[PDB]
Amino acid sequence: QTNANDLRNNEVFFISPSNNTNKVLDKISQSEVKLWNKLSGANQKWRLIYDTNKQAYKIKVMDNTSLILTWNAPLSSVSVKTDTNGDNQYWYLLQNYISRNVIIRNYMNPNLVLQYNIDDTLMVSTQTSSSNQFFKFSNCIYESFNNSTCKIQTSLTIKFIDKNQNSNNVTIWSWNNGDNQKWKILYNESKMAYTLTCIKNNEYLTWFSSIGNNVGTYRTEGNNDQYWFINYLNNDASMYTISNFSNQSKFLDVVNSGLADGTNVQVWDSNGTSAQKWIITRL
Amino acid sequence: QTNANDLRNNEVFFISPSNNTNKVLDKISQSEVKLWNKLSGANQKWRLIYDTNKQAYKIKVMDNTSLILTWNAPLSSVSVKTDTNGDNQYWYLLQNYISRNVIIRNYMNPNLVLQYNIDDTLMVSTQTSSSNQFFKFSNCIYESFNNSTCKIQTSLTIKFIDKNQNSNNVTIWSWNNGDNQKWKILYNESKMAYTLTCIKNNEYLTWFSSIGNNVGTYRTEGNNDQYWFINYLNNDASMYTISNFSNQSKFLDVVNSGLADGTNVQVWDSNGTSAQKWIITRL
């Protein structure tokens, strides 16, 4: 139904066993992983990091530890460990087109794939036709927010994305409960990106690409500068970046990290600062 | 760039080694397969037949022999043999999202995948990280006809799809070299189906689906009855079926198999007759 769960570089996923949508791959401690009941905590979320030479991925937990899924060669166990770029920490993600099921096949020893056991433990094993070696990937951000109305807070202070009443200009402002501060998030299948639609005027959060660096709202023309990528912070699934479809380097940004009402929301070159960190919450 | 090469049930493909797009899997004799340089024979074309229970496919050669790709258990050789629905004749097709490369992994013994050797022979083997176990799949019809102008002959007699002068109607007619007998075929990424635009008037071949069985031409609105699926005959890649996106059971049909100039063209329930068999030729 959607291409939003495709195995894209730099997206974040729940990894579930094919036999149970309510369990997910879960970092349970400093080193151990297991299948666990789905709670949508950061320790159940995994960023894919593709290497184009190997055609394989690293699988990184998003609880801010930066640990990656690791085959404990020469044993049959798996863990989460420091990224040392080991062959044993790379995994092919090879997908069945119809069912969407994926094998997670080790790069160092491609005889071996990830397997889930009856008792919810994980291991690597030689390959069989059992469903205990098939997993599904669901994109966390799409699950959280697609076709949903949201408040969007700057990390800098308790202030939200606000469309001006006279202008179509976007600023940060305190919570009014106003429709000018509420945004309908919707994935576009064809662009493979999001629109954010102000509830007040039913138009798209827009980087005015022609004019300069200003972000406001604008007509629903579907121009390139009206589409956005929404991701978690590189290491941390408690906050989000919002970057523009027209230029990936351009991130939604509070001008000069201004803390007060009315301070302008723009796009700015990618920098890692708190000015470009946001908190999207569903209403 | 295109979803047209996706590993769809009931499509026909060239199967290429990842290291060379000019080579394809070729049935060279009654029982043997080998990589060969890409030519135009139906012995280099393979239909996928998916089993929902197995999550795997049979891979059927299209030279009208009906033979399918077979692991010669317990040896390491492969061949083409009579379809017995053997576990050794089913193959998982598991694909890498970014590169589009596919492993061809045996259902009976999933330790084993198809491998191409430097001498162009094929075998099965335990899995490695080598490019010699990665294949590309290219949809033959898309490669043959996308964005090209074609003539379309009924199998019944040497006559062609023809938009009449005085109406929107389509019939079969003897060849005039007329613009009204020429059809631009173009795949639509969203619909995952083709349009056929009459060169004379820039209109889509269209089933008038609200009011009867008639096929003619109509304005480029992009309605469901203006899109078509183009496939080879189930067994035989010298001829084609053309069926309607609106309702897949409705196939392009020469009314009552009339052989004469002006015989109407319609859609009709799938029945395997010569009236529903066409010959598409690129001009």
Coordinates of C-alpha atoms in Angstrom, one line a residue:
Chain A
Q1 CA 0.0 0.0 0.0
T2 CA 2.9 2.5 0.8
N3 CA 6.5 2.8 -0.2
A4 CA 7.2 4.6 3.1
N5 CA 8.5 1.3 4.7
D6 CA 11.1 0.7 2.0
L7 CA 14.6 -0.2 3.3
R8 CA 16.1 3.3 2.8
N9 CA 19.5 4.4 4.0
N10 CA 19.2 6.6 7.0
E11 CA 15.6 5.7 8.0
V12 CA 14.5 4.4 11.4
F13 CA 12.5 1.2 11.8
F14 CA 10.7 -1.2 14.0
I15 CA 12.0 -4.7 13.1
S16 CA 9.4 -7.3 13.9
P17 CA 9.2 -11.1 13.4
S18 CA 6.9 -12.0 10.4
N19 CA 4.7 -14.1 12.7
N20 CA 3.8 -11.2 15.2
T21 CA 3.3 -7.5 14.5
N22 CA 3.1 -6.8 18.3
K23 CA 6.7 -7.9 19.0
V24 CA 9.8 -6.0 17.9
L25 CA 13.6 -6.2 18.1
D26 CA 14.4 -4.6 21.5
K27 CA 17.8 -3.6 23.1
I28 CA 17.1 -4.8 26.6
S29 CA 20.4 -3.9 28.3
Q30 CA 23.9 -2.4 27.5
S31 CA 24.7 -5.5 25.3
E32 CA 21.6 -7.7 24.8
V33 CA 18.8 -7.8 22.3
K34 CA 15.6 -9.7 22.3
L35 CA 12.1 -9.7 20.9
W36 CA 9.7 -7.8 23.2
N37 CA 6.2 -6.5 23.2
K38 CA 6.0 -3.3 21.1
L39 CA 6.0 -0.1 23.2
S40 CA 7.6 2.4 20.6
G41 CA 10.5 3.2 23.0
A42 CA 13.8 4.5 21.6
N43 CA 15.4 1.1 22.4
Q44 CA 13.1 -0.6 19.9
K45 CA 14.1 1.7 17.1
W46 CA 16.9 1.1 14.6
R47 CA 18.6 3.3 12.0
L48 CA 19.8 1.7 8.8
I49 CA 23.3 2.7 7.6
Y50 CA 24.1 1.4 4.1
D51 CA 27.5 0.8 2.7
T52 CA 27.4 1.0 -1.1
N53 CA 30.5 -1.2 -1.6
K54 CA 29.2 -4.1 0.5
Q55 CA 25.5 -3.6 -0.5
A56 CA 24.8 -4.2 3.2
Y57 CA 23.8 -2.3 6.3
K58 CA 24.6 -1.5 9.8
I59 CA 21.6 -1.6 12.2
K60 CA 21.9 1.1 14.9
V61 CA 19.8 1.3 18.1
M62 CA 18.3 4.8 18.7
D63 CA 18.4 5.0 22.5
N64 CA 21.4 7.4 22.3
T65 CA 24.0 4.6 23.0
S66 CA 25.1 4.3 19.3
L67 CA 25.4 0.5 19.6
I68 CA 24.9 -1.7 16.5
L69 CA 23.5 -5.2 15.9
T70 CA 26.5 -7.6 16.0
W71 CA 27.0 -11.3 15.2
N72 CA 29.3 -12.6 18.1
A73 CA 31.5 -14.6 15.8
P74 CA 32.4 -17.4 16.1
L75 CA 29.4 -18.1 18.4
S76 CA 25.8 -18.2 17.2
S77 CA 24.7 -15.3 19.5
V78 CA 24.0 -11.7 18.7
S79 CA 24.4 -8.5 20.7
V80 CA 24.6 -4.7 20.5
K81 CA 28.2 -3.4 20.5
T82 CA 30.3 -0.4 19.7
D83 CA 30.5 0.2 15.9
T84 CA 33.9 -1.0 14.8
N85 CA 32.8 -1.4 11.2
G86 CA 33.3 -5.1 11.5
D87 CA 32.1 -7.4 8.7
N88 CA 30.1 -9.2 11.4
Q89 CA 28.2 -5.9 12.1
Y90 CA 27.1 -5.6 8.5
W91 CA 23.9 -7.2 7.3
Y92 CA 22.3 -7.8 3.9
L93 CA 18.6 -6.9 4.0
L94 CA 17.1 -9.0 1.2
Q95 CA 13.4 -8.4 0.6
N96 CA 10.5 -10.5 -0.8
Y97 CA 8.5 -8.2 -3.1
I98 CA 5.0 -9.5 -2.5
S99 CA 5.0 -10.4 1.3
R100 CA 7.5 -7.5 2.2
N101 CA 9.3 -10.0 4.5
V102 CA 13.1 -9.5 4.8
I103 CA 16.0 -11.8 5.6
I104 CA 18.8 -10.2 7.7
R105 CA 21.8 -12.0 6.4
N106 CA 25.3 -11.5 7.9
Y107 CA 27.9 -9.9 5.6
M108 CA 30.9 -11.7 7.2
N109 CA 29.2 -15.1 6.9
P110 CA 26.3 -15.0 4.5
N111 CA 25.4 -18.6 5.3
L112 CA 23.9 -17.1 8.5
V113 CA 20.8 -15.1 9.0
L114 CA 19.1 -13.6 12.0
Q115 CA 16.5 -16.0 13.5
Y116 CA 13.9 -15.5 16.2
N117 CA 13.2 -18.4 18.6
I118 CA 9.9 -19.5 20.3
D119 CA 11.2 -18.0 23.6
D120 CA 11.7 -14.6 21.9
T121 CA 15.6 -14.9 21.9
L122 CA 17.6 -14.2 18.8
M123 CA 20.5 -15.9 17.2
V124 CA 22.1 -16.5 13.8
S125 CA 21.5 -19.8 11.9
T126 CA 22.0 -21.4 8.6
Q127 CA 19.0 -20.8 6.3
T128 CA 15.7 -22.6 6.1
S129 CA 12.3 -22.0 4.7
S130 CA 10.8 -21.3 8.1
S131 CA 9.1 -18.0 8.9
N132 CA 11.4 -17.7 12.0
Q133 CA 14.0 -16.2 9.6
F134 CA 11.7 -13.5 8.0
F135 CA 11.2 -10.1 9.5
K136 CA 9.1 -7.0 8.6
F137 CA 10.4 -3.4 8.7
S138 CA 8.0 -0.5 9.6
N139 CA 9.2 3.1 9.3
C140 CA 8.6 4.6 12.8
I141 CA 7.9 8.2 11.7
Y142 CA 5.3 7.2 9.2
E143 CA 3.6 5.0 11.8
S144 CA 3.7 7.9 14.3
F145 CA 2.5 10.8 12.2
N146 CA 1.1 10.0 8.7
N147 CA -2.3 11.4 8.1
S148 CA -2.2 13.1 11.5
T149 CA -2.5 16.5 13.1
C150 CA 0.5 17.6 15.1
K151 CA 2.0 20.3 17.3
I152 CA 5.7 21.0 16.5
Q153 CA 7.9 22.4 19.2
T154 CA 11.4 23.8 18.9
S155 CA 13.9 22.2 21.3
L156 CA 15.2 25.7 22.2
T157 CA 12.1 26.5 24.4
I158 CA 8.4 25.6 24.9
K159 CA 7.3 27.3 21.7
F160 CA 5.6 26.0 18.5
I161 CA 5.4 26.3 14.8
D162 CA 3.1 29.3 14.3
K163 CA 1.6 30.8 11.0
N164 CA 1.1 34.6 11.3
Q165 CA -2.6 35.7 10.7
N166 CA -1.8 38.7 8.3
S167 CA 1.3 37.2 6.6
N168 CA 1.7 33.6 5.6
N169 CA 4.9 33.7 7.7
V170 CA 6.0 31.0 10.1
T171 CA 7.5 31.8 13.5
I172 CA 7.9 30.1 16.9
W173 CA 5.2 31.2 19.5
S174 CA 3.7 30.0 22.8
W175 CA 0.8 27.6 22.8
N176 CA -2.6 29.2 21.9
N177 CA -4.4 26.0 21.0
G178 CA -4.9 27.8 17.7
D179 CA -5.4 26.2 14.3
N180 CA -2.5 28.3 13.0
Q181 CA -0.2 26.2 15.3
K182 CA -1.6 22.8 14.2
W183 CA -0.2 20.9 11.2
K184 CA -1.5 17.9 9.3
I185 CA 1.4 15.6 8.4
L186 CA 0.9 13.6 5.2
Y187 CA 3.3 11.4 3.2
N188 CA 3.4 11.8 -0.6
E189 CA 4.0 8.5 -2.3
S190 CA 5.3 10.0 -5.5
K191 CA 7.8 12.5 -4.0
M192 CA 8.6 10.1 -1.1
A193 CA 8.4 13.0 1.2
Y194 CA 6.0 14.8 3.6
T195 CA 3.7 17.8 3.3
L196 CA 2.8 19.7 6.5
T197 CA -0.6 21.5 6.1
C198 CA -1.6 24.3 8.4
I199 CA -5.1 23.6 9.7
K200 CA -6.1 27.3 9.7
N201 CA -5.7 28.0 5.9
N202 CA -5.2 24.4 4.6
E203 CA -1.9 25.2 2.8
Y204 CA 1.6 23.8 2.9
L205 CA 4.6 24.6 5.0
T206 CA 6.8 26.2 2.4
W207 CA 10.4 27.3 2.0
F208 CA 10.1 30.4 -0.3
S209 CA 13.0 29.1 -2.5
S210 CA 12.9 31.9 -5.0
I211 CA 12.9 34.8 -2.6
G212 CA 15.5 33.7 0.0
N213 CA 15.6 31.7 3.3
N214 CA 12.1 32.4 4.6
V215 CA 9.6 29.6 5.6
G216 CA 5.9 30.3 5.6
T217 CA 2.7 28.7 4.2
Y218 CA 1.6 28.9 0.6
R219 CA -0.9 27.5 -2.0
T220 CA -1.2 23.7 -2.5
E221 CA 0.6 23.7 -5.9
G222 CA 2.9 20.8 -4.9
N223 CA 6.2 22.7 -5.7
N224 CA 9.4 21.0 -4.7
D225 CA 10.0 23.5 -1.9
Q226 CA 6.7 22.4 -0.4
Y227 CA 7.9 18.9 0.5
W228 CA 9.9 17.9 3.5
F229 CA 12.0 15.0 5.0
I230 CA 11.3 14.2 8.6
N231 CA 13.8 12.1 10.5
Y232 CA 15.0 11.6 14.0
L233 CA 18.2 13.2 15.2
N234 CA 21.1 11.1 14.0
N235 CA 21.6 9.3 17.3
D236 CA 18.5 10.2 19.3
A237 CA 14.8 9.3 18.6
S238 CA 13.4 11.8 21.1
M239 CA 13.8 14.7 18.6
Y240 CA 13.4 15.4 14.9
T241 CA 15.0 17.3 12.0
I242 CA 12.8 18.7 9.2
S243 CA 14.7 19.2 5.9
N244 CA 13.5 20.4 2.5
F245 CA 12.8 18.2 -0.6
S246 CA 14.2 21.0 -2.9
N247 CA 17.5 21.1 -1.1
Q248 CA 18.5 18.3 1.4
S249 CA 21.1 20.5 3.1
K250 CA 18.4 23.0 4.1
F251 CA 16.9 22.3 7.5
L252 CA 14.0 24.0 9.3
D253 CA 15.7 26.5 11.7
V254 CA 15.0 29.1 14.3
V255 CA 16.9 32.3 13.3
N256 CA 20.1 32.8 15.4
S257 CA 18.5 30.5 18.1
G258 CA 16.2 33.3 19.2
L259 CA 14.2 32.3 22.3
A260 CA 11.2 34.7 22.2
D261 CA 7.8 34.8 20.6
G262 CA 7.8 35.9 16.9
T263 CA 11.4 34.9 16.2
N264 CA 11.5 33.8 12.5
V265 CA 11.5 30.2 11.3
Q266 CA 13.7 29.8 8.3
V267 CA 15.7 27.1 6.5
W268 CA 19.5 27.0 7.1
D269 CA 22.4 24.8 6.1
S270 CA 22.7 21.6 8.2
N271 CA 24.7 22.2 11.4
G272 CA 23.6 19.9 14.3
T273 CA 22.5 22.8 16.6
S274 CA 19.4 22.9 18.8
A275 CA 18.0 25.6 16.5
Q276 CA 17.3 22.8 13.9
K277 CA 16.0 20.2 16.5
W278 CA 12.2 19.8 16.9
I279 CA 9.7 17.9 18.9
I280 CA 6.7 16.7 16.8
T281 CA 3.8 15.5 18.9
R282 CA 0.6 14.0 17.7
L283 CA -2.8 15.4 18.6
Chain B
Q1 CA 14.0 5.2 -11.6
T2 CA 11.1 2.8 -12.5
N3 CA 9.0 0.3 -10.6
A4 CA 8.4 -1.5 -14.0
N5 CA 11.1 -4.0 -13.1
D6 CA 9.6 -5.0 -9.8
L7 CA 9.4 -8.8 -9.0
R8 CA 5.8 -9.1 -9.9
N9 CA 3.9 -12.3 -10.2
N10 CA 3.1 -13.2 -13.8
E11 CA 5.7 -10.8 -15.4
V12 CA 8.4 -11.9 -17.8
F13 CA 12.0 -10.9 -17.3
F14 CA 15.5 -11.0 -18.6
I15 CA 17.7 -12.4 -15.7
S16 CA 21.2 -10.9 -15.9
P17 CA 24.3 -11.4 -13.8
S18 CA 25.0 -8.2 -11.7
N19 CA 28.4 -7.8 -13.4
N20 CA 27.2 -7.7 -17.0
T21 CA 23.9 -6.2 -18.4
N22 CA 24.6 -7.6 -21.9
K23 CA 24.3 -11.2 -20.7
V24 CA 21.1 -13.1 -19.8
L25 CA 20.0 -16.4 -18.6
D26 CA 19.4 -18.4 -21.8
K27 CA 17.8 -21.9 -22.3
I28 CA 20.3 -23.2 -24.9
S29 CA 18.8 -26.7 -25.5
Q30 CA 16.0 -28.9 -24.2
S31 CA 17.5 -29.2 -20.7
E32 CA 20.5 -26.8 -20.3
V33 CA 20.7 -23.2 -19.3
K34 CA 23.7 -20.9 -19.5
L35 CA 24.4 -17.1 -19.6
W36 CA 24.5 -15.8 -23.1
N37 CA 24.7 -12.5 -24.9
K38 CA 21.4 -10.7 -25.0
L39 CA 19.6 -11.4 -28.3
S40 CA 15.9 -11.5 -29.2
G41 CA 14.8 -15.2 -28.5
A42 CA 12.0 -16.2 -26.2
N43 CA 14.5 -18.7 -24.7
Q44 CA 16.0 -15.8 -22.9
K45 CA 12.7 -14.7 -21.3
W46 CA 11.4 -16.1 -18.0
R47 CA 7.9 -15.8 -16.4
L48 CA 7.6 -15.6 -12.6
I49 CA 4.9 -17.8 -11.0
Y50 CA 4.5 -17.0 -7.3
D51 CA 3.2 -19.3 -4.6
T52 CA 1.7 -17.4 -1.7
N53 CA 2.3 -20.3 0.8
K54 CA 6.0 -20.8 0.0
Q55 CA 6.7 -17.1 -0.6
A56 CA 8.8 -18.4 -3.6
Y57 CA 8.5 -18.6 -7.3
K58 CA 8.8 -20.9 -10.3
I59 CA 10.8 -19.4 -13.2
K60 CA 9.4 -20.5 -16.5
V61 CA 11.1 -20.2 -19.9
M62 CA 9.0 -18.5 -22.6
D63 CA 10.0 -20.5 -25.7
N64 CA 6.6 -22.5 -25.6
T65 CA 8.2 -25.5 -23.9
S66 CA 6.9 -24.7 -20.4
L67 CA 10.1 -25.9 -18.7
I68 CA 11.1 -24.3 -15.4
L69 CA 14.4 -23.6 -13.7
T70 CA 15.4 -26.7 -11.6
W71 CA 18.1 -27.5 -9.0
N72 CA 19.2 -31.1 -9.9
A73 CA 19.3 -32.3 -6.2
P74 CA 21.4 -33.7 -4.9
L75 CA 24.0 -32.5 -7.4
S76 CA 25.1 -28.8 -7.7
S77 CA 23.9 -28.4 -11.3
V78 CA 20.8 -26.6 -12.6
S79 CA 18.6 -27.3 -15.6
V80 CA 15.2 -26.6 -17.1
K81 CA 12.7 -29.4 -16.6
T82 CA 9.0 -30.2 -16.7
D83 CA 7.1 -28.4 -14.0
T84 CA 6.4 -31.0 -11.2
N85 CA 5.9 -28.3 -8.5
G86 CA 9.0 -29.7 -6.8
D87 CA 10.5 -27.9 -3.9
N88 CA 13.7 -27.8 -6.0
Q89 CA 11.9 -25.9 -8.7
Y90 CA 10.9 -23.1 -6.3
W91 CA 13.1 -20.1 -5.7
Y92 CA 13.0 -17.2 -3.3
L93 CA 13.8 -13.9 -5.1
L94 CA 15.2 -11.7 -2.3
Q95 CA 16.2 -8.2 -3.4
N96 CA 18.4 -5.4 -2.2
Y97 CA 16.5 -2.1 -2.2
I98 CA 19.2 0.2 -3.3
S99 CA 21.2 -1.8 -5.9
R100 CA 18.1 -3.8 -7.1
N101 CA 20.3 -6.9 -7.0
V102 CA 18.5 -10.2 -6.3
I103 CA 19.6 -13.5 -4.8
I104 CA 17.9 -16.6 -6.3
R105 CA 17.7 -18.9 -3.3
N106 CA 16.4 -22.5 -3.6
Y107 CA 13.2 -23.3 -1.7
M108 CA 14.1 -27.0 -1.1
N109 CA 17.6 -26.1 0.3
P110 CA 17.8 -22.4 1.2
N111 CA 21.5 -22.8 2.0
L112 CA 21.8 -22.7 -1.8
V113 CA 21.6 -19.9 -4.3
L114 CA 22.0 -19.6 -8.0
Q115 CA 25.6 -18.7 -9.0
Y116 CA 27.1 -17.7 -12.3
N117 CA 30.7 -18.8 -13.1
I118 CA 33.3 -17.0 -15.2
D119 CA 32.8 -19.5 -18.0
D120 CA 29.1 -18.4 -18.2
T121 CA 27.8 -21.7 -16.7
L122 CA 25.4 -21.7 -13.8
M123 CA 25.2 -23.8 -10.6
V124 CA 24.0 -23.6 -7.1
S125 CA 26.3 -22.9 -4.1
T126 CA 26.4 -21.9 -0.5
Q127 CA 26.2 -18.2 -0.1
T128 CA 29.1 -15.7 -0.2
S129 CA 29.5 -11.9 -0.5
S130 CA 30.5 -12.3 -4.2
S131 CA 28.7 -10.5 -7.0
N132 CA 28.5 -13.9 -8.7
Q133 CA 25.3 -14.7 -6.7
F134 CA 23.6 -11.4 -7.4
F135 CA 21.3 -11.1 -10.5
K136 CA 19.3 -8.2 -12.1
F137 CA 15.7 -8.6 -13.3
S138 CA 14.5 -6.5 -16.4
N139 CA 10.9 -6.6 -17.5
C140 CA 11.0 -7.5 -21.2
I141 CA 7.8 -5.6 -22.3
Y142 CA 8.9 -2.4 -20.6
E143 CA 12.3 -2.7 -22.3
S144 CA 10.7 -3.6 -25.7
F145 CA 8.0 -0.9 -25.9
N146 CA 8.1 1.8 -23.3
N147 CA 7.9 5.2 -24.9
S148 CA 7.8 3.8 -28.4
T149 CA 5.4 3.9 -31.3
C150 CA 3.9 0.6 -32.3
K151 CA 1.6 -1.3 -34.7
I152 CA -0.7 -3.9 -33.1
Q153 CA -1.9 -6.8 -35.2
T154 CA -4.7 -9.3 -34.4
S155 CA -3.4 -12.9 -34.5
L156 CA -6.5 -13.8 -36.6
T157 CA -5.4 -12.1 -39.8
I158 CA -3.0 -9.4 -41.1
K159 CA -5.0 -6.4 -39.8
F160 CA -4.3 -3.8 -37.2
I161 CA -5.7 -1.7 -34.4
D162 CA -7.2 1.3 -36.2
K163 CA -9.0 4.5 -35.1
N164 CA -11.8 5.3 -37.6
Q165 CA -12.0 8.7 -39.3
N166 CA -15.6 9.7 -38.5
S167 CA -15.8 8.5 -34.9
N168 CA -13.8 7.8 -31.7
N169 CA -14.2 4.1 -32.6
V170 CA -11.5 1.4 -32.9
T171 CA -11.6 -1.6 -35.2
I172 CA -9.1 -3.9 -37.1
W173 CA -8.1 -2.8 -40.5
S174 CA -5.5 -3.7 -43.2
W175 CA -2.3 -1.8 -43.0
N176 CA -2.4 1.8 -44.5
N177 CA 0.8 3.1 -42.8
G178 CA -1.7 5.6 -41.3
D179 CA -1.2 7.6 -38.2
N180 CA -4.5 6.2 -37.0
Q181 CA -2.9 2.7 -37.0
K182 CA 0.0 3.8 -34.8
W183 CA 0.1 3.7 -31.0
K184 CA 2.5 5.3 -28.6
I185 CA 3.0 3.0 -25.6
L186 CA 3.9 4.6 -22.3
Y187 CA 4.1 3.1 -18.8
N188 CA 2.6 5.1 -16.0
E189 CA 4.6 4.8 -12.6
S190 CA 1.5 5.5 -10.4
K191 CA -1.0 3.2 -12.1
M192 CA 1.7 0.6 -12.8
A193 CA 0.0 0.1 -16.2
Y194 CA 0.3 1.4 -19.8
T195 CA -1.4 4.0 -22.0
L196 CA -1.7 3.6 -25.8
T197 CA -1.9 7.0 -27.5
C198 CA -3.2 7.1 -31.1
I199 CA -0.6 9.1 -33.1
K200 CA -3.4 10.7 -35.3
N201 CA -5.2 12.5 -32.4
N202 CA -3.1 12.2 -29.2
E203 CA -5.9 10.3 -27.5
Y204 CA -5.8 7.2 -25.3
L205 CA -7.1 3.8 -26.4
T206 CA -10.1 3.5 -24.0
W207 CA -12.7 1.1 -22.9
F208 CA -16.0 2.9 -22.6
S209 CA -16.6 1.0 -19.4
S210 CA -19.8 2.8 -18.1
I211 CA -21.8 2.1 -21.2
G212 CA -20.8 -1.3 -22.8
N213 CA -17.9 -3.3 -24.2
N214 CA -16.6 -0.9 -26.8
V215 CA -13.1 0.2 -27.2
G216 CA -12.2 3.4 -28.9
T217 CA -10.1 6.5 -28.3
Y218 CA -10.9 9.2 -25.7
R219 CA -9.4 12.5 -24.3
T220 CA -6.4 12.1 -22.0
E221 CA -8.3 12.4 -18.8
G222 CA -6.4 9.5 -17.2
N223 CA -9.4 7.5 -16.1
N224 CA -9.1 3.9 -14.9
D225 CA -10.5 2.5 -18.2
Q226 CA -7.7 4.3 -20.1
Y227 CA -4.9 2.1 -18.7
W228 CA -3.9 -1.3 -19.8
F229 CA -1.8 -4.3 -18.8
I230 CA 0.3 -5.7 -21.7
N231 CA 1.7 -9.2 -21.2
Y232 CA 2.9 -12.2 -23.2
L233 CA 0.7 -15.2 -23.7
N234 CA 1.0 -17.3 -20.7
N235 CA 3.3 -19.7 -22.4
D236 CA 4.5 -18.0 -25.5
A237 CA 6.4 -14.7 -25.9
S238 CA 5.6 -14.2 -29.7
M239 CA 2.2 -12.9 -28.9
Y240 CA 0.5 -10.6 -26.4
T241 CA -2.6 -10.0 -24.4
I242 CA -3.8 -6.4 -23.6
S243 CA -6.2 -6.1 -20.6
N244 CA -7.9 -3.3 -18.9
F245 CA -6.7 -1.6 -15.6
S246 CA -10.4 -0.9 -14.6
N247 CA -11.2 -4.7 -14.6
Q248 CA -8.3 -7.2 -15.2
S249 CA -10.7 -9.9 -16.5
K250 CA -11.5 -7.7 -19.6
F251 CA -9.2 -8.4 -22.5
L252 CA -8.9 -6.6 -25.8
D253 CA -10.9 -8.7 -28.3
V254 CA -11.9 -8.8 -31.9
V255 CA -15.7 -9.2 -31.8
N256 CA -16.7 -12.8 -32.8
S257 CA -13.3 -13.3 -34.4
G258 CA -14.4 -11.5 -37.6
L259 CA -11.6 -11.4 -40.2
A260 CA -12.8 -8.4 -42.2
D261 CA -11.9 -4.7 -42.4
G262 CA -14.0 -2.8 -39.9
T263 CA -14.6 -5.6 -37.4
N264 CA -15.1 -3.9 -34.1
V265 CA -12.6 -4.1 -31.2
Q266 CA -13.9 -4.5 -27.7
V267 CA -13.0 -5.8 -24.3
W268 CA -14.4 -9.2 -23.4
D269 CA -14.0 -11.8 -20.6
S270 CA -10.7 -13.6 -20.6
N271 CA -11.0 -16.8 -22.7
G272 CA -7.6 -17.7 -24.3
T273 CA -8.9 -17.4 -27.9
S274 CA -7.0 -16.1 -30.9
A275 CA -9.3 -13.1 -30.8
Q276 CA -7.6 -11.9 -27.6
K277 CA -4.0 -12.5 -28.9
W278 CA -2.1 -9.7 -30.5
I279 CA 1.3 -8.9 -32.1
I280 CA 2.8 -5.7 -30.9
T281 CA 5.7 -4.4 -33.2
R282 CA 7.8 -1.4 -32.5
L283 CA 8.2 1.0 -35.5

